[PDB]
C-alpha cells in the first residue's frame, strides 16, 4: 500500500526488472500474421 512513497529505489528496481524481463523475451518469440486457427484435417488418398 503506502510503502512505495518512502523508498523510490525499490519501485524503480521493480519497474526495470519487469522491463528487462520483457525486452529479453521480445527477441525470442516467433512472429506470424495469425496464430493457428484453422481446424486440422486429414486426407486419405487411394488409386484404381
Amino acid at each position: 500500500p503506502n510503502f512505495f512513497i518512502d523508498r523510490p529505489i525499490f519501485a524503480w528496481v521493480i519497474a526495470i526488472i519487469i522491463m528487462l524481463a520483457g525486452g529479453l523475451a521480445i527477441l525470442k518469440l516467433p512472429v506470424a500474421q495469425y496464430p493457428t486457427i484453422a481446424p486440422p484435417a486429414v486426407t486419405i488418398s487411394a488409386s484404381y
Partner: protein, 138 residues
C-alpha cells in the same frame, strides 16, 4: 487497444495529487500520501471491471475462440500490470518529480465545468422526463 487504457489509472492518480495540492496547498510528498487514501477503490475497480469482461471469452470454441484468446491474454495482462504500476511506481514518481495560449483553456474548461454542473442541477428534478428519452435510445 490497451495504450489508451493502461494510462487510465496512472492519469487518475496524478490528477488527484495535483487536485489535492492546488485546492489545498500541500507539498507533493505530503499530498500523494493524502490522495492515495481516497481513490484506492476507484483504481482498484477500473482495472477489475475493465479486465473482467475479457476473461469470459477466453473459453469459447471454434476458430472464433482462437481469435478471441489473442485479445484476451493481451488486455488482461495489460490491466493487471497497469494496476501494479499505478499502485507501486506512480506514487514514487509523484513524490519526487511533481514540483510544488495555455491561458485560454483553464477558464474555458472552468466555464464548461460550471455550466455542466448547472445543467446537471437542472436535470435532477425531472427524472420522469429524462426516463422516456433514455428508453427511446434503447
Amino acid at each position: 487497444l490497451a495504450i489508451g487504457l493502461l494510462v487510465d489509472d496512472a492519469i487518475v492518480v496524478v490528477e488527484n495529487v495535483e487536485r489535492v495540492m492546488a485546492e489545498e496547498g500541500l507539498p507533493p510528498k505530503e499530498a500523494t500520501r493524502k490522495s492515495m487514501g481516497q481513490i484506492q477503490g476507484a483504481l482498484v475497480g477500473i482495472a477489475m471491471v475493465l479486465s473482467a469482461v475479457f476473461v469470459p471469452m477466453a473459453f469459447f470454441g471454434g476458430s472464433t475462440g482462437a481469435i478471441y484468446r489473442q485479445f484476451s491474454i493481451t488486455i488482461v495482462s495489460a490491466m493487471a500490470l497497469s494496476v501494479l504500476v499505478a499502485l507501486i511506481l506512480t506514487p514514487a514518481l509523484c513524490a519526487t518529480m511533481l514540483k510544488p495560449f495555455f491561458g485560454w483553456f483553464n477558464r474555458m474548461f472552468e466555464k464548461s465545468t460550471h455550466h455542466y454542473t448547472d445543467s446537471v442541477g437542472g436535470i435532477l428534478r425531472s427524472t420522469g422526463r429524462y426516463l422516456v428519452l433514455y428508453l427511446i435510445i434503447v
